[PDB]
Amino acid sequence: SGFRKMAFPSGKVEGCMVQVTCGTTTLNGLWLDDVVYCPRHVICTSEDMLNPNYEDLLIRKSNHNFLVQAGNVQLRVIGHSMQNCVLKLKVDTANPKTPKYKFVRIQPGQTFSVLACYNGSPSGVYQCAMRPNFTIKGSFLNGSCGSVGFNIDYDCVSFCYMHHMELPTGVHAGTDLEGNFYGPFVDRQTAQAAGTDTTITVNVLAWLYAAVINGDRWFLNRFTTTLNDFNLVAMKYNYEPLTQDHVDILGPLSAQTGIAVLDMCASLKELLQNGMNGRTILGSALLEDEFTPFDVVRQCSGVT
Amino acid sequence: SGFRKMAFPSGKVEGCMVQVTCGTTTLNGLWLDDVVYCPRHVICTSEDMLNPNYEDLLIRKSNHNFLVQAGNVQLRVIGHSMQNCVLKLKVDTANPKTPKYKFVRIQPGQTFSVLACYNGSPSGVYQCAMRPNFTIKGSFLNGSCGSVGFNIDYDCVSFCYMHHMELPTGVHAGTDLEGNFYGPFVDRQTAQAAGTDTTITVNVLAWLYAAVINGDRWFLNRFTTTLNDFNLVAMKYNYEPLTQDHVDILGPLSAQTGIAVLDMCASLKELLQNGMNGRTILGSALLEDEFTPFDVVRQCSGVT
Ligand SMILES: C[C@H]1CN(C(=O)Cn2cccn2)CCO1
Numbered sequence: 001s002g003f004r005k006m007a008f009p010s011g012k013v014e015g016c017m018v019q020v021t022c023g024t025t026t027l028n029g030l031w032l033d034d035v036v037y038c039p040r041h042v043i044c045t046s047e048d049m050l051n052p053n054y055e056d057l058l059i060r061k062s063n064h065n066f067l068v069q070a071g072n073v074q075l076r077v078i079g080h081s082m083q084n085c086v087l088k089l090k091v092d093t094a095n096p097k098t099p100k101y102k103f104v105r106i107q108p109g110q111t112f113s114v115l116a117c118y119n120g121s122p123s124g125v126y127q128c129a130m131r132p133n134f135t136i137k138g139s140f141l142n143g144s145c146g147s148v149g150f151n152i153d154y155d156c157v158s159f160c161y162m163h164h165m166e167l168p169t170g171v172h173a174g175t176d177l178e179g180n181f182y183g184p185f186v187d188r189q190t191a192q193a194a195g196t197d198t199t200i201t202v203n204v205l206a207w208l209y210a211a212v213i214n215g216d217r218w219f220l221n222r223f224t225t226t227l228n229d230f231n232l233v234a235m236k237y238n239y240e241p242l243t244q245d246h247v248d249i250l251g252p253l254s255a256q257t258g259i260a261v262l263d264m265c266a267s268l269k270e271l272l273q274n275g276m277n278g279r280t281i282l283g284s285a286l287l288e289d290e291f292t293p294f295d296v297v298r299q300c301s302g303v304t
Numbered sequence: 305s306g307f308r309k310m311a312f313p314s315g316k317v318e319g320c321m322v323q324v325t326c327g328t329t330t331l332n333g334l335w336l337d338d339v340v341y342c343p344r345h346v347i348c349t350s351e352d353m354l355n356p357n358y359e360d361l362l363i364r365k366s367n368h369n370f371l372v373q374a375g376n377v378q379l380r381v382i383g384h385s386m387q388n389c390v391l392k393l394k395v396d397t398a399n400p401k402t403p404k405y406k407f408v409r410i411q412p413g414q415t416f417s418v419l420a421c422y423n424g425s426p427s428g429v430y431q432c433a434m435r436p437n438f439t440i441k442g443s444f445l446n447g448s449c450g451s452v453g454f455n456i457d458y459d460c461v462s463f464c465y466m467h468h469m470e471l472p473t474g475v476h477a478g479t480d481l482e483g484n485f486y487g488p489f490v491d492r493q494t495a496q497a498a499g500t501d502t503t504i505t506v507n508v509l510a511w512l513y514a515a516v517i518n519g520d521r522w523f524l525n526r527f528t529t530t531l532n533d534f535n536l537v538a539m540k541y542n543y544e545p546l547t548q549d550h551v552d553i554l555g556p557l558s559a560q561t562g563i564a565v566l567d568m569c570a571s572l573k574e575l576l577q578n579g580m581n582g583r584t585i586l587g588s589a590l591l592e593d594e595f596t597p598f599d600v601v602r603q604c605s606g607v608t
């Protein structure tokens with residue numbers, strides 16, 4: 001029993017983290033096979049960052065200008081290329097700790113683990129969600145860029161995020177490992193405002209299921225609803241619309257608990273309209289939306 | 305910016321987790337040097353657990369009855385001993401991945417990371433606190449016993465917890481790595497009720513400091529208080545008494561923010577008496593108490 005905000009074990013990713021230095025900028029790189037992946041803004045002065053022309057800045061950079069340190073040993077850079085907003089530094093040594101891996105681009109509402117690193121060294125691990133506005137709410141200080149987000153699915157480390165930026169509102173923006181930003185964000189120190197940070201409804205419902213499975217049941221009510229009725233209330237509360245695809249995804253949790261998904265929607269509707277009245281669910285005073293239905297099943301079943 | 309419930313990177317502990325089987329009970333062991341540490345209840349039938357005599361049950365056990373598997377390779381058990389509520393299984397192979405380590409017994413209010421494991425395989429990592437009633441609020445399914453709690457301090461993995469039990473109220477009890485339970489709990493399937501789960505005041509104050517450092521400042525008020533005045537309100541709200549030792553520990557966060565500790569106490573006092581009024585602090589609708597002052601400094605400074 002018990003339900004925790006749980007990250008994946010980070011060891012497989014720890015073994016991939018290196019330090020990348022260009023001039024006096026140090027940040028983190030990801031070493032898979034004989035490639036090191038890092039934010040292309042490693043090449044920028046903080047002045048460069050106001051309006052960087054990356055292709056022009058890169059002309060001034062040779063392989064020997066990229067210093068890559070794995071622990072306290074230097075890796076030899078034998079090639080570099082820019083792919084979207086990441087650099088790929090080809091090194092002469094394959095990472096001997098390279099796990100089985102994939103690069104995946106996740107959808108808003110999908111969760112992942114972040115291994116926060118500084119100078120290529122792991123400081124901590126936490127669980128994030130890709131917000132509906134394509135920001136994440138991380139914990140990232142200067143030096144943390146190139147820290148990665150990942151899931152460990154089916155004996156494969158799926159890398160989904162690399163840290164690039166903090167917006168003026170202190171939320172975070174980054175890329176997939178092909179260097180494509182999530183959302184409309186750019187690696188430039190300019191006015192970038194995030195859109196509405198809506199609640200990930202399907203994740204809230206998953207977490208209410210987790211709550212019932214762990215004996216937190218006070219919020220279960222005598223009502224049901226329809227997707228259309230529920231969605232009218234969701235819209236009003238800045239919740240994401242629930243689709244039949246979401247209802248299908250919650251099927252296994254519905255089965256396990258015997259609570260129809262639309263009944264749980266009507267319980268969520270009353271929680272929105274009535275509030276928590278000073279009560280908690282799984283030790284939270286607000287409705288948690290950074291657990292996917294897959295996360296709830298995984299944690300409630302003990303997958304390794 | 306940003307402040308996350310962050311666990312230590314788990315790789316150093318992942319490399320220590322093994323499977324221990326006695327008859328048809330499988331749980332987790334910790335492999336350091338040539339010793340495997342596991343809950344002594346590995347030897348019990350679920351019937352045994354109602355009133356176990358461990359010394360008597362152990363007479364029936366030989367080295368060859370303890371099956372220890374590290375990945376998919378069997379370790380040879382060449383000795384076993386009971387120390388308090390743990391077994392120490394001496395194996396013929398030193399763990400080649402043994403990190404620098406210490407065994408420490410933590411105090412209530414101290415936080416640590418748990419690597420939840422099943423069949424000796426890591427499933428996830430999360431941050432816990434030793435509650436003032438010497439329980440933890442974990443996430444532990446059948447098979448998770450022998451999962452460990454740890455801190456990584458000063459290039460040393462300090463193991464502080466091994467999972468043994470779930471109480472009927474679904475909170476958790478375990479031992480240090482010398483096999484001594486935290487609190488009054490025993491490894492027997494009997495009525496064990498936890499005491500008052502008080503809020504860890506010094507940790508709440510640390511987290512309010514973290515909130516100010518990360519720009520969440522709405523709760524800062526125009527008042528101060530004294531330890532005695534504050535403690536009268538704390539007592540009423542089931543908060544731990546604040547001591548001058550706690551005030552001293554918060555000194556660096558006071559200095560960094562320029563908010564006197566007693567001013568922050570008076571802000572906390574108003575939050576208790578007035579409530580959150582539907583507002584959040586660092587994305588929480590309740591006052592978080594599972595960050596120590598050391599955790600706030602570490603995360604706000606980027607220690608690796
Ligand atoms: C030779 C490498 C392989 N490693 C793995 O994690 C393999 N792996 C990935 C997913 C499942 N298993 C890390 C350390 O050394």
Ligand SMILES: C[C@H]1CN(C(=O)Cn2cccn2)CCO1
Pocket residue numbers: 316319400401402403404405459460461
């Ligand atoms: C030979 C072992 C050593 N390991 C360490 O983590 C060492 N270490 C502990 C604290 C800081 N460093 C794990 C893998 O192989």
